[PDB]
Amino acid sequence: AQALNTLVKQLSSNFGAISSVLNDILSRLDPPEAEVQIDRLITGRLQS
Amino acid sequence: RCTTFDDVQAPNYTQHTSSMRGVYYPDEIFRSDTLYLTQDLFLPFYSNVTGFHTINHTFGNPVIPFKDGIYFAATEKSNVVRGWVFGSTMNNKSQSVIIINNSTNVVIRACNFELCDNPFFAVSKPMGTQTHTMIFDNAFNCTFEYISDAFSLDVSEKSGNFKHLREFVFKNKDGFLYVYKGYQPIDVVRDLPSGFNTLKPIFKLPLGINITNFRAILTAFSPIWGTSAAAYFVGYLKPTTFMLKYDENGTITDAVDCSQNPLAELKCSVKSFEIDKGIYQTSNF
Amino acid sequence: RVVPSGDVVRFPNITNLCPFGEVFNATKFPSVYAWERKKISNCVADYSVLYNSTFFSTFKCYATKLNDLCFSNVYADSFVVKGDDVRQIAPGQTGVIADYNYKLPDDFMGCVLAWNTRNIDATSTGNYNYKYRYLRHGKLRPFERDISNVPFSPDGKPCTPPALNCYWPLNDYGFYTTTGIGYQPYRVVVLSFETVCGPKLSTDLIKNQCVNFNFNGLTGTGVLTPSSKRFQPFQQFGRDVSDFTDSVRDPKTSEILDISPCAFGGVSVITPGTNASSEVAVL
Numbered sequence: 171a172q173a174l175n176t177l178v179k180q181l182s183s184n185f186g187a188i189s190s191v192l193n194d195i196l197s198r199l200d201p202p203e204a205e206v207q208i209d210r211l212i213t214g215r216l217q218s
Numbered sequence: 219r220c221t222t223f224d225d226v227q228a229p230n231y232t233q234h235t236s237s238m239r240g241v242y243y244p245d246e247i248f249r250s251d252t253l254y255l256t257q258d259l260f261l262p263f264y265s266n267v268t269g270f271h272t273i274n275h276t277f278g279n280p281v282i283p284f285k286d287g288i289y290f291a292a293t294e295k296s297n298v299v300r301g302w303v304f305g306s307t308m309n310n311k312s313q314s315v316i317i318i319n320n321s322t323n324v325v326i327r328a329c330n331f332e333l334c335d336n337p338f339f340a341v342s343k344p345m346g347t348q349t350h351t352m353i354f355d356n357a358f359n360c361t362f363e364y365i366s367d368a369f370s371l372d373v374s375e376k377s378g379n380f381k382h383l384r385e386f387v388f389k390n391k392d393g394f395l396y397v398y399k400g401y402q403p404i405d406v407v408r409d410l411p412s413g414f415n416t417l418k419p420i421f422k423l424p425l426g427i428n429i430t431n432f433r434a435i436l437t438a439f440s441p442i443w444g445t446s447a448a449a450y451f452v453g454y455l456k457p458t459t460f461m462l463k464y465d466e467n468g469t470i471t472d473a474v475d476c477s478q479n480p481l482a483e484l485k486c487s488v489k490s491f492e493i494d495k496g497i498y499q500t501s502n503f
Numbered sequence: 504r505v506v507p508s509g510d511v512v513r514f515p516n517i518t519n520l521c522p523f524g525e526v527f528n529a530t531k532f533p534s535v536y537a538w539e540r541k542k543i544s545n546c547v548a549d550y551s552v553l554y555n556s557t558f559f560s561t562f563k564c565y566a567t568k569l570n571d572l573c574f575s576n577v578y579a580d581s582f583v584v585k586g587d588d589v590r591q592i593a594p595g596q597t598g599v600i601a602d603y604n605y606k607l608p609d610d611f612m613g614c615v616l617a618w619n620t621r622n623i624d625a626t627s628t629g630n631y632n633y634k635y636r637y638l639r640h641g642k643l644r645p646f647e648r649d650i651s652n653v654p655f656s657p658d659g660k661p662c663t664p665p666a667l668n669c670y671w672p673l674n675d676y677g678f679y680t681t682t683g684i685g686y687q688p689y690r691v692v693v694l695s696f697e698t699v700c701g702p703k704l705s706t707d708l709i710k711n712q713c714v715n716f717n718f719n720g721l722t723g724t725g726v727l728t729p730s731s732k733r734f735q736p737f738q739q740f741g742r743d744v745s746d747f748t749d750s751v752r753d754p755k756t757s758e759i760l761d762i763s764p765c766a767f768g769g770v771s772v773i774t775p776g777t778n779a780s781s782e783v784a785v786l
């Protein structure tokens with residue numbers, strides 16, 4: 171239960187982006203504002 | 219018309235421990251079968267409050283600090299506290315908000331009002347109807363005006379016990395004043411009943427004033443105006459951590475403050491009411 | 504992955520692209536502490552008319568934030584700043600405009616539209632009659648107006664002008680024609696983002712299919728079907744035991760729905776060997 175929920179709650183970590191949501195960073199921000207913070211949340215979630 | 223009274227006394231300052239007050243729905247999220255931990259601007263449990271026994275010569279509404287938000291309670295028999303001036307200077311010098319319930323509508327405006335030195339409802343005492351909103355005389359450089367949908371409230375002087383308990387929470391955010399409403403029937407002799415009661419969202423109010431003080435507009439009662447019996451409080455919203463137990467219908471059924479005592483700081487770590495016997499690591503000092 | 508089939512666009516009742524003279528047509532803009540409020544409600548707006556005018560020259564949104572619109576009322580805020588105070592019209596960012604004159608909300612964020620008024624709203628002695636707050640006993644919260652036409656007490660004590668060592672709350676900008684761009688008066692419309700919706704149409708509830716969906720405050724792909732969840736009337740949508748939304752009250756017809764994601768998973772291949780055969784069966 172813990173190792174799934176710790177894997178769950180680290181979805182919601184910002185990792186230095188303006189949010190932990192890849193589709194807000196996709197849609198709401200600029201395309202230069204996107205790829206800066208897309209590349210943050212992947213490298214965060216990948217090694218999580 | 220800016221008029222005064224014959225006598226304005228100080229309340230009885232009767233102390234009370236607010237047990238389970240201040241709870242509301244923060245969000246619009248439905249959740250069920252769950253147990254959710256959050257901070258928001260909450261009234262804390264077991265909070266020492268003071269009883270503002272307004273009785274027939276006592277009239278407590280000076281400049282009262284708001285600063286982020288306040289909790290309000292009122293056991294009511296005569297339905298006295300029905301208005302609130304919000305603002306900073308409490309004079310005709312800065313932009314203020316007069317929220318009144320004038321027994322027909324909720325009238326809310328955001329202006330630089332000609333604020334009187336006495337915020338009251340000029341209401342005839344043996345029958346309970348308002349002659350004039352003697353809080354402002356007129357208004358200047360407004361930003362907002364609204365009248366709610368119509369109903370009626372009996373606001374004459376009543377005797378016996380308090381039959382009406384209204385729960386109010388006011389907060390400044392993004393221009394939007396959020397005013398939330400709670401209610402239960404009561405049968406109340408003294409300061410406050412213990413028990414649990416939530417609040418629900420009613421108002422989203424882009425008022426745009428610097429909200430740093432409040433003067434809770436009371437109701438004046440005289441057939442030279444007076445008042446009558448009303449027990450109402452002032453509480454303060456603090457950034458404290460709450461548990462939010464949701465039942466199967468999504469009603470908040472109970473809540474636990476984390477910052478009361480080491481028993482309830484443990485509950486927020488376990489995320490339960492049930493805690494087994496032993497020792498549990500909690501956060502560092 | 505199952506590739507979806509259908510669009511679900513559900514909203515309350517639809518109006519057209521309304522003209523907004525408060526966006527691009529106003530000629531004189533007042534002070535910033537007493538910033539003029541005009542609002543936008545119940546119109547499917549793009550605010551392309553911010554660009555489409557001969558009254559403005561900057562065209563920047565705080566500009567992909569132009570389409571940041573499926574929420575409550577937008578407030579087209581009219582005021583003239585200086586070039587050194589163009590920078591402070593921001594969500595937060597507490598300078599002399601944001602901390603005391605005009606603070607911006609931060610759920611969504613609109614567009615700040617300035618215009619070169621060197622020849623109309625300025626003079627060579629400084630058009631000082633436009634003013635701004637620089638120091639006040641109390642900070643603004645977001646989306647507030649300050650109409651205190653009052654001689655100010657700089658520390659909370661009874662020191663009001665015209666007494667000695669008692670300050671005014673208003674400095675002069677310095678709207679000079681003889682200076683550069685940093686001291687010019689700039690007519691600024693700000694769309695304060697705090698009911699309009701940009702991508703607002705109405706399509707069909709394509710139920711029981713892997714679809715796309717766009718709702719009042721809810722986007723995504725998945726499977727749609729009615730739900731039985733006891734929504735409160737003040738509750739828009741539901742979430743699961745995790746933290747993504749799986750239930751929604753319909754923006755158009757208030758039918759309580761479920762949102763399951765689309766089906767997906769892994770693939771195996773069951774083969775008996777190339778020496779054995781050349782047929783496979785997949786799982």
Ligand SMILES: *[C@@H]1O[C@H](CO)[C@@H](O[C@@H]2O[C@H](CO)[C@@H](O[C@@H]3O[C@H](CO)[C@@H](O)[C@H](O)[C@@H]3O)[C@H](O)[C@H]2NC(C)=O)[C@H](O)[C@H]1NC(C)=O
Pocket residue numbers: 465466467733
């Ligand atoms: C969530 O709210 C719903 C109401 O929308 C609750 O459902 C209703 O609950 C009451 C009380 O348990 C049920 O009444 C009972 O009826 C039986 C059948 O005759 C009777 O023997 C009992 O003495 C009682 O009166 C009512 O039937 C039920 N509604 C339906 C449609 O079944 C529900 O209980 C709430 N959730 C929770 C967790 O309480």
Ligand SMILES: *[C@@H]1O[C@H](CO)[C@@H](O)[C@H](O)[C@H]1NC(C)=O
Pocket residue numbers: 233266267
């Ligand atoms: C609450 O504060 C008041 C201060 O006026 C004090 O007299 C009272 O004893 C306090 N309540 C408790 C339960 O200590």
Ligand SMILES: *[C@@H]1O[C@H](CO)[C@@H](O)[C@H](O)[C@H]1NC(C)=O
Pocket residue numbers: 778
């Ligand atoms: C394929 O399987 C048969 C089974 O007896 C074996 O004799 C043969 O050597 C296999 N083929 C190769 C290339 O090894």
